[PDB]
Amino acid sequence: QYVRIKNWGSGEILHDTLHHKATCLGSIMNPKSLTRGPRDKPTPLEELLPHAIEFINQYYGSFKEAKIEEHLARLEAVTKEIETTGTYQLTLDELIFATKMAWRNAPRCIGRIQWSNLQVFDARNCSTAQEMFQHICRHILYATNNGNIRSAITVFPQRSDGKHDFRLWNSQLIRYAGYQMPDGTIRGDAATLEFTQLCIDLGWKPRYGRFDVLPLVLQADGQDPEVFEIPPDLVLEVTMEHPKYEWFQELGLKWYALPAVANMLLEVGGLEFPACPFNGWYMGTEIGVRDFCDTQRYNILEEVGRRMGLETHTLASLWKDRAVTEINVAVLHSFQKQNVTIMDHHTASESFMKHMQNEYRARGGCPADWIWLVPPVSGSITPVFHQEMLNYVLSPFYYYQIEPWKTHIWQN
Amino acid sequence: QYVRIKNWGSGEILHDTLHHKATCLGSIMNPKSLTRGPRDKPTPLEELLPHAIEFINQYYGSFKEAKIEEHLARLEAVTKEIETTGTYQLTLDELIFATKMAWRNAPRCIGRIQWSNLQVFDARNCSTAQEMFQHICRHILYATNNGNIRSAITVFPQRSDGKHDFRLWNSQLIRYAGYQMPDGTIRGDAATLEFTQLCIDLGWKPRYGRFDVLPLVLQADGQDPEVFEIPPDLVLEVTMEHPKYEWFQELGLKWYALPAVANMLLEVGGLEFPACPFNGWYMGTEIGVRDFCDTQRYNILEEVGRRMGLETHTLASLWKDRAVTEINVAVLHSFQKQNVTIMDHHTASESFMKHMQNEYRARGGCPADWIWLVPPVSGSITPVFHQEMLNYVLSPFYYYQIEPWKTHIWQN
Ligand code: HEM
Ligand code: HEM
Ligand SMILES: CCOC(=O)N1CCC(Nc2cc(C)ccn2)CC1
Ligand SMILES: CCOC(=O)N1CCC(Nc2cc(C)ccn2)CC1
Ligand SMILES: C[C@H](O)[C@H](O)[C@H]1CNc2nc(N)[nH]c(=O)c2N1N=O
Ligand SMILES: C[C@H](O)[C@H](O)[C@H]1CNc2nc(N)[nH]c(=O)c2N1N=O
């Protein structure tokens, strides 16, 4: 009937029924269950129609006051379109509803309380890489909003036969380059070494800097990817300063204000959109902990430790715990001072708890991935840590995809 | 053939084959798969014998230089014993091997690098509650070792028909009481309110203190549980002090030095031991973060915040991150100063990584529960966070049990 869920902090119990509408490798980053790969043929009609009907029923079923006639008419119209064209086009309202539901159904997102607040850019009529670039620049500009970050998503043309896929090769819209310097050292973001090289191979000019914004590698209509530099005026950045440590600024650190996922696929009513970049606003720890403190990234932990005069040669001293916190304080302080939207992990965590509570009352469940929802620092200090969660895949959904460079058949 | 596992920090890859020897509710605390319940009849022979043979093969297969004749003789002897008695007794060496393997197979234990270092107390001949108490006191004394903590396990009589089970009703050997005071406030450990009341119902005298060591509630031969106060001389405690904050001592905090799990069941070769308390040594965060900072426990976070002069009314200030770290420092500092064994979470985490590496080479796998292995603070700062893990149940294994008070048929 339902799955019992308990919060070991408040003792509160919840009943999950939503998992029934779903379609031990728990700590796996990219499991097949969260990946929707490529195709070389259109979706079989026997599979498409049922999914299409289901979504249309879900859409019309979401209205406060039902509109039965429109519901029947749409069901009929969709079927006919599938029979006559082999697929169908979602109405703008349906697409908007789908993008919000997919966000609402994202198990790895802690910011889901904001799910109903999403700007949707319909770029389904797009046809060239240049046009993609223009849509993306428009998105970046709208979302950035001079620091007052706004959530948005740009929907490109849906997959037809799988041979004409629109794809953004970048993992994120804004990301820094990584360079393997002559002296053997690594400059910039060590995690983008391979992708940076790819950009260089495609004609992009390497600037050998610590924070060089990578260009957009855009694939349109299944054709070879084209490189486009993002106009610097569109990239808002925050310079890192500490409210007490004047020497923090001497580290010369900065980060971009816009967190935008660029390579995921939107699945809805049998349709697949291989290109649908979206963004929200940053949670402090993403920058302060992952970007700055992961060893395979900027790895600034030890340097910050020394400057604080900490016993960096004795792990038991907990110097790492002290350093990471000052870096997190720097990130939040800098964004706030520069009037750029950002949320700390404690506030975000409480926000998600409220959302989860809302979801269980509204639809009897909330797909959630504990491993991703608990922040990279102060785990049990946040309420999410004490909350039992059920991880399942619904529809609409935002899936991962196989890296484009691994399945792309080059034309030259 | 094997399951591919990746460390997203070092990029290292590992192949898991051990999961084949195994017998999404990932964040569930007490799932049925980790619980081994009660019975009212002996284990069916058709089930027992196969498991017994398997274990005997595993035991003899662990020797560097094989002893084929002894192996065959033991296999024959065990079968005959099962046919003539309906069960069998493990040799002391087999039991020792089983306890270490079960520890080695504990997915939720970060201290497994120490798996081969375990003192085993054979109490299989025990028959009364008084005798249980004496064995437990002996265990506590040996393990405590005047601060130089030693890992040990006491094995009580195996389950026969399930009606004569030896059980320790306590979750841990040493634990503090919780009292619902007259003024409505809670004194002591809020998490032991119900169990404390049970002890009181059984005749134990409540001392209404903040740190009152709970008595042992012992069940022997399936009979009603008897209460036994632990002699204070056997309970080593550490008074909490901060290396810089003289006011920390004013909080009047302390904690016991001995971490001992008391209510789990040891499964091995078809046999079940409902009573087998074991202990290792503490990892700082257990006390500093869970015991002291969980809201449903001692909840000292805000008080420590104020005393540090922090902005405790502004979450974004990250005051909680600053407070929890000073508490962790206090715990480690206090244990070290009082010469009581303890390990910080960073060192423990690195220790487990080394162990995992050792296990994959030795037997092609290491069952691990990411959700429990990643410390309650500084998650991504530890290497375990970046390690993909596979969680599976092998044999021998340490299982949870249904709370005794829920299935016990009282004789009076
Ligand atoms: C409004 C503010 C938002 C906040 C603060 C927020 C925060 C986060 C954070 C912290 C993550 C983890 C990122 C990582 O560790 O890689 C995440 C993941 C995710 N978010 Fe949100 N989010 C927001 C908006 C959105 C929006 C607008 C969408 C979609 C329309 C969305 C979709 C997702 C998805 C699908 C993931 C998983 C990405 C992956 O698996 O790599 N989020 N979000
Ligand atoms: C030598 C030092 C040891 C250290 C530092 C260590 C540390 C830990 C820690 C931190 C936990 C988590 C406790 C919790 O969150 O509830 C744990 C769990 C566990 N440990 Fe170890 N351990 C050690 C020795 C042992 C020994 C000697 C055994 C068994 C013979 C063992 C068996 C287990 C088991 C089965 C669990 C899971 C308990 C549960 O699920 O509640 N550990 N250990
Ligand atoms: C390692 C580079 O990471 C990133 O560029 N990002 C981290 C991952 C991802 N974060 C996000 C995404 C969204 C949509 C909202 C808040 N936070 C996008 C930004
Ligand atoms: C909430 C009370 O918790 C406890 O008494 N403990 C916490 C849970 C458990 N910890 C342990 C156990 C072992 C065997 C080794 C290290 N640490 C036993 C002690
Ligand atoms: C191995 C493990 O799955 C991986 O390190 C995880 C852990 N948690 C997590 N949370 C978020 N929000 N983002 C992430 O990328 C990860 N993963 N790690 O990097
Ligand atoms: C809900 C979740 O499973 C629970 O809060 C967990 C999380 N992790 C964890 N690790 C250890 N080592 N011990 C634990 O008890 C827990 N759980 N929580 O208390």
Q: Which positions in chain A touch B346 (Cβ < 8 Å)?
A: 315-316, 318, 320
- For residue B374, the tally of other CB atoms under 10 A from its CB is 26
Residue A173 has which token pair?
């819209």
Distance CA A147, CA B7 (A): 35
Instruction: Tell me which H or E stretch contains A74.
Output: helix A68-85
Provide residues with CB under 6 Å of ligand 2. Answer: B 99, 103, 106, 108-111, 114, 118, 151, 153, 261, 278, 280-281, 283, 286, 343, 398
Is residue B109 annotated as part of the catalytic site, yes or no? yes
Q: Sort out which chain A residues have CB atoms less than 8 A from B377's CB and list them.
A: 321, 377-381
All CATH 3.90.440.10 domain ranges in chain B, comma separated: 125-150+165-236+400-404
Q: Active site includes B410?
A: no
Structure tokens at A322: 């002290």
- Type of residue at A293: C
Q: What is the Cα–Cα distance from B294 to B284, expressed in whole angstroms? A: 14
Q: Chain B, 92-151: which have a CB under 8 Å from a chain A CB?
A: none
| Start-to-end Cα distance in chain A | 56
Paired strand residues for A227: A217
CATH architecture of A11-124+151-161+265-279+349-373: Alpha-Beta Complex (3.90)
- Using the mean position of ligand 5's atoms as its centre, give its distance from the Cα of residue B45 in Å: 46
Report yes or no: A156 and A167 within 8 Å, Cβ to Cβ.
no
Of A8, A26, A378, the CB nearest to B370: A26
Residue the block writes with tokens 């005051």 = B319
Resolution for this PDB entry, in angstroms: 2.2
Q: Which helix (H) or strand (E) holds B14?
A: strand B13-16
Element (H, E) at A16: strand A13-16
CA distance A263 to A281: 17
* Torsion region of B399: left, alpha or beta (phi above 0 gives left; psi -120 to 50 gives alpha): beta
Q: Is B138 a catalytic residue?
A: no
Q: By alpha-carbon position, which residue is closest to atom 10 of ligand 5? A: A372
**Cβ proximity of A330 and A323 under 8 Å:** no
Q: Cα separation of B101 and B90, whole Å?
A: 14
Tokens at A221, concatenated: 């209509």
Determine the Cα–Cα distance for residues A373 and A109; give it in Å rounded to an integer.
7
- Among the bound ligands, name the one nearest to the CA of residue A260: 3
Q: Residue A336: its chain B contacts at CB < 8 A? A: 316
CATH 3.90.1230.10 placement within chain B: 237-259+282-347
Token pair listed for A196: 């940076």
Residue A56 phi/psi, 5° resolution? -60, -40
Q: A393: which residues sit within 8 A by CB, 6+ positions away?
A: A22, A23, A33, A34, A105, A107, A367
Is A124 part of the annotated catalytic residue set?
no
DSSP string, A339-373: T---B-HHHHHHHHHHHHHHHHHHHS-----HHHH
Task: For Cα atoms A86, A89, A93, give the angle at the middle one, nearest 5 degrees.
Answer: 155
* Cα–Cα–Cα angle for B322, B323, B327, rounded to 5 degrees: 120
User: Cβ of B381 and A320 within 8 Å?
Assistant: yes
Which residues of B are less than 8 Å from A344 in CB distance? 315-316, 318
The residues, ordered by sequence, that sit 6+ positions from A186 with a Cβ below 8 Å of its Cβ are: A178, A179, A180, A193
Longest dimension (CA), chain A: 72
Q: Tell me if B379 and A374 make a contact (CB, 8 A cut-off).
A: yes
Round to whole Å and give the CA distance between B96 and A224.
64
Nearest to B371 among A10, A28, A371 (CB): A371
CATH class for the region spanning A125-150+165-236+400-404: alpha beta
Cβ of B263 below 6 Å from ligand 4 = no
Q: Give 3-state DSSP helix, strand, coil % of chain A, rounded to 5.
A: 40, 15, 45
How far apart are the C-alpha atoms of B357 and A22, rounded to whole Å? Answer: 36
Every domain of chain A with CATH number 3.90.340.10 lies at 11-124+151-161+265-279+349-373
Q: How was this structure determined?
A: X-ray
Q: Whose CA is nearest to atom 19 of ligand 3?
A: A259
Q: What is the CATH number of domain A237-259+282-347?
A: 3.90.1230.10
Catalytic residue among B36, B94, B104, B109: B109
Q: Is residue A398 within 6 Å of ligand 1 at its C-beta?
A: yes
A282 in Cβ contact with A335 (< 8 Å) = yes
